[PDB]
Amino acid sequence: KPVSVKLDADIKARVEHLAETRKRSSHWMMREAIREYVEREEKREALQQEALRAWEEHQTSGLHVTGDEVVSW
Amino acid sequence: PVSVKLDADIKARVEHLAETRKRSSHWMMREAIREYVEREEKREALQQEALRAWEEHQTSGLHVTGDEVVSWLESWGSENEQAALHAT
Amino acid sequence: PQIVFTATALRDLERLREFPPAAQRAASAIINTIRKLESYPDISFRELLIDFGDTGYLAMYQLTVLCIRHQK
Amino acid sequence: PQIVFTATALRDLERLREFLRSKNPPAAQRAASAIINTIRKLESYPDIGRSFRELLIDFGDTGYLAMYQYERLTVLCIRHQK
């Protein structure tokens, strides 16, 4: 399912230069660059949700802490 | 500029991700390539300095054995440490 | 600051505890981490670092509300 | 194989050492063991990576990257910080 992307020129030049070296296609080039991005942000914004769910559980209940001295657990 | 890319199901994970962190799908994709080419240009750099390092070793011919640096390394952090020599 | 801890961060510690000097080892790395937070909270919240020995852990927080500390 | 280091790999080790000082409290002795493990696992099953390949050496905070070649003495060239 093709989709157009406006490139910053100068990069496209750096994109196409690494394609000369690696002896691969400028298309498969970015074809990975998109995967490795989401393949990383999918996990990072997955643990963001974990910590964000903890905030939801606190912002609606009690808690303890001080220092090695619990209070309202 | 203005050239097109085509992905498969991955674009769905993109468009879904380009909605969670509420960002532009078209923007996100671009950051991907920059981060990529930046990382990947640094990999191409490590290649040559690796490749060069060799070319120097093949010409110079000098080296150190793993045992010597194994000998060196086992004294790291234990006050009386050591150095490294250079055999030919 | 008051240096608070969440339930999700509390159970992430009990997860930790289970896993040889360690009983009194990694505990010291967190009490250091705890008390340097009582002064320097660093700085959108940032879950701080944590390193002792084998590998390091990840205590995310925001009172400094400490929510979730996963193994990285 | 002979497991040989290059001059470039020795001084990547030197940079490395002189660093850890201001790096991990006692991970100097922790990084050292990781390399000797990587050194003597090259002495045996010599392979891994990506016509020579690379090899990652993991220890504590983060890890480094050994690069090496070959047919009877895996010359070890370059170990930068990744």
Residue numbers in the entry:
A (entry chain B): 5 to 77
B (entry chain A): 6 to 93
C (entry chain D): 2 to 20, 26 to 49, 59 to 77, 84 to 93
D (entry chain C): 2 to 51, 59 to 78, 82 to 93
From the paper:
The proteins SO_1444 (ParESO) and SO_1445 (CopASO) in the CP4So prophage from Shewanella oneidensis were recently characterized as a typical type II TA pair, with an important role in CP4So maintenance after its excision in host cells. The toxin ParESO can severely inhibit cell growth and cause filamentous growth. The antitoxin CopASO can neutralize ParESO toxicity by direct and tight protein–protein binding. CopASO can bind to a DNA motif in the promoter region containing two inverted repeats (5′-GTANTAC (N)3GTANTAC-3′) to repress the transcription of the TA operon.
The crystal structure of the ParESO-CopASO complex was determined by the single-wavelength anomalous dispersion (SAD) method using a Se-Met-labeled protein. The structure belonged to the space group P43212, and was refined to a final R/Rfree factor of 0.29/0.30 at 3.80 Å resolution. There was a CopASO homodimer binding two respective ParESO molecules in an asymmetric unit (ASU). The resulting heterotetramer adopted an overall very open, V-shaped architecture with the organization of ParESO-(CopASO)2-ParESO. The antitoxin CopASO is composed of an N-terminal RHH domain (β1, α1, and extended α2) and a C-terminal toxin-binding domain (α3 and the extended loop). The two neighboring CopASO molecules dimerize via the RHH domain to mediate the DNA binding. Notably, the intrinsically disordered C-terminal domain is induced to fold into a partially ordered conformation upon ParESO binding. Structural analysis showed that the toxin–antitoxin contacts were mainly mediated by the C-terminal domain (α3 and C-terminus of α2) of CopASO and the two helices (α1 and α2) of ParESO. Remarkably, surface-charge analysis of CopASO showed the C-terminal extension was predominantly distributed with negative charges (such as Glu54, Glu60, Glu61, and Glu86), which perfectly complemented positively charged regions in and around the binding grooves (such as Arg18, Arg22, and Arg90).
